[PDB]
Amino acid sequence: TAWRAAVYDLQYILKASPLNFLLVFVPLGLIWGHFQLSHTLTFLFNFLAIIPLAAILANATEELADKAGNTIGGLLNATFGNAVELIVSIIALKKGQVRIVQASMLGSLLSNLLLVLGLCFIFGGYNRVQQTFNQTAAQTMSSLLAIACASLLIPAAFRATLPFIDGKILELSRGTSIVILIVYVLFLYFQLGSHHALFEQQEEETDEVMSTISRNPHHSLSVKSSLVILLGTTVIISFCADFLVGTIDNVVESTGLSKTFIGLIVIPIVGNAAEHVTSVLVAMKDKMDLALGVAIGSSLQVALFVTPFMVLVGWMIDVPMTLNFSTFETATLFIAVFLSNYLILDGESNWLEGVMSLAMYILIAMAFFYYPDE
Ligand SMILES: CCCCCCCC/C=C/CCCCCCCC(=O)OC[C@H](O)CO
Ligand SMILES: CCCCCCCC/C=C/CCCCCCCC(=O)OC[C@H](O)CO
Ligand SMILES: CCCCCCCC/C=C/CCCCCCCC(=O)OC[C@H](O)CO
Ligand SMILES: CCCCCCCC/C=C\CCCCCCCC(=O)OC[C@H](O)CO
Ligand SMILES: CCCCCCCC/C=C\CCCCCCCC(=O)OC[C@H](O)CO
Ligand SMILES: [Ca+2]
Ligand SMILES: [Ca+2]
Ligand SMILES: [Ca+2]
Ligand SMILES: [Ca+2]
Ligand SMILES: [Ca+2]
Ligand SMILES: [Mn+2]
Ligand SMILES: [Mn+2]
């Protein structure tokens, strides 16, 4: 049984993962990257390969964190819950790709604020008059997110509004990151302590809806079974991430796309696509609050943990990772933050709110497509 039960446990993980059909790009990604066949396809194949792995790793992390206990479980979600964003950004930092990391962090927020928002409102609202989410955990978390993004943008808004200064921007970003990371710890105490019931119920509800859609009885993987998949999926992602990051300069050169565009629009898809599909499917079950909850939760991690931690990592390995986003990026994120929060606060969405949000994201991507590289 110890062999055949391990097989079923693997089946349970794959069947709980939305876009598992893209796993076919894992060997292709590995082949192309290792043999260094063609840069553009090496980018694309690994790009496609990490997407299902993120979901696989997420379900492994979640299954492990459940039996890990309160304190440790939260640390696992801080770590392996953000692994894709973490791994890719760390590898990118180790190759001096500061702009890529900066754009990917902000882009991840943009995608969660506008893109998945639009998709959820469209797919959930096309066959309904409206969808309500008043007085839900989604609105609560949304308020926190509004402050989180604003805080993260402060050093950027600072440099943008300036009338030597190089070392001070670095010092400000690093001091800011310490503060935000203190907040993140308190956010964990909020999440796992005083308001544990709020997040727990939202998590259980989301799992229940996902089990309904995925159509497989909830099976709790053993610590051993989940830890293998966890460390297994992680090393594969690392390989694919390394290949993907190693081709950035070439893809930038072969195509006409800037590092900013690739970082802001392309890269975030990697760690969000699986979660986005999840959010959409839940929204179609007329449970927008849960759908929004997933997207808002991921944004909180990027804003409160991943982004400031990356500047800390940069400090450790002597790469000048900063919160010094471009002026347009700064302005854009502020726009997205206002609107998303306004839309989430109005309490009722429709399919048109989704069309327009989606259109705006496209318009932003279109604008960033014209953003100058030199
Ligand atoms: C579900 C998984 C099923 C997987 C089924 C895969 C079957 C083929 C496997 C080949 C692995 C080795 C591939 C080797 C490819 C080498 C590429 C090549 O040789 O190109 C070099 C290039 O010419 C430099 O200039
Ligand atoms: C109420 C007003 C309070 C603010 C008043 C201004 C305070 C200025 C100092 C920053 C404190 C931030 C605490 C964390 C400081 C770490 C910053 C740091 O160490 O920077 C070194 C730099 O990284 C080397 O390159
Ligand atoms: C039964 C009640 C009556 C039926 C209700 C029908 C609902 C309408 C659905 C719209 C799908 C969304 C349309 C596709 C999304 C367009 C987004 C957009 O902005 O597209 C820009 C364009 O792609 C740039 O070239
Ligand atoms: C580190 C991640 C490895 C991912 C593996 C994906 C599947 C590769 C299949 C066969 C391994 C080939 C072993 C090495 C033998 C081929 C020689 C090789 O290294 O080719 C690369 C080329 O030299 C460039 O400089
Ligand atoms: C629930 C009632 C119906 C039951 C049957 C369900 C049928 C689902 C139909 C279409 C799902 C469309 C999902 C669209 C998700 C697209 C999101 C995406 O793939 O990625 C977004 C972005 O590009 C990454 O950052
Ligand atoms: Ca769970
Ligand atoms: Ca409960
Ligand atoms: Ca879950
Ligand atoms: Ca996430
Ligand atoms: Ca209202
Ligand atoms: Mn249902
Ligand atoms: Mn609305």
Curated annotation (Swiss-Prot):
Keyword Disulfide bond: no
GO cellular component: fungal-type vacuole; fungal-type vacuole membrane
A molecular function GO annotation: potassium:proton antiporter activity
Domain of life: Eukaryota
Stretches of the chain found on the membrane's Vacuolar side: 33-38, 94-105, 163-176, 249-260, 316-321
Subcellular location as annotated: Vacuole membrane
Keywords recorded for this protein, A-Z: Acetylation, Calcium, Calcium transport, Ion transport, Manganese, Membrane, Metal-binding, Phosphoprotein, Transmembrane, Transmembrane helix, Transport, Vacuole
Main location: membrane
GO annotation terms (biological process): calcium ion transmembrane transport; calcium ion transport; intracellular calcium ion homeostasis; transmembrane transport
Pfam families in the cross-refs: Na_Ca_ex
Transmembrane segments annotated in the record for this chain: 10-32, 39-61, 71-93, 106-125, 140-162, 177-199, 226-248, 261-283, 293-315, 322-344, 354-371
Record's signal peptide: none
PANTHER family with a match to the protein in the record: VACUOLAR CALCIUM ION TRANSPORTER (PTHR31503:SF22)
Chain's role: Has a role in promoting intracellular calcium ion sequestration via the exchange of calcium ions for hydrogen ions across the vacuolar membrane. Involved also in manganese ion homeostasis via its uptake into the vacuole.
Protein's name in the database: Vacuolar calcium ion transporter
Organism per entry: Saccharomyces cerevisiae (strain ATCC 204508 / S288c) (Baker's yeast)
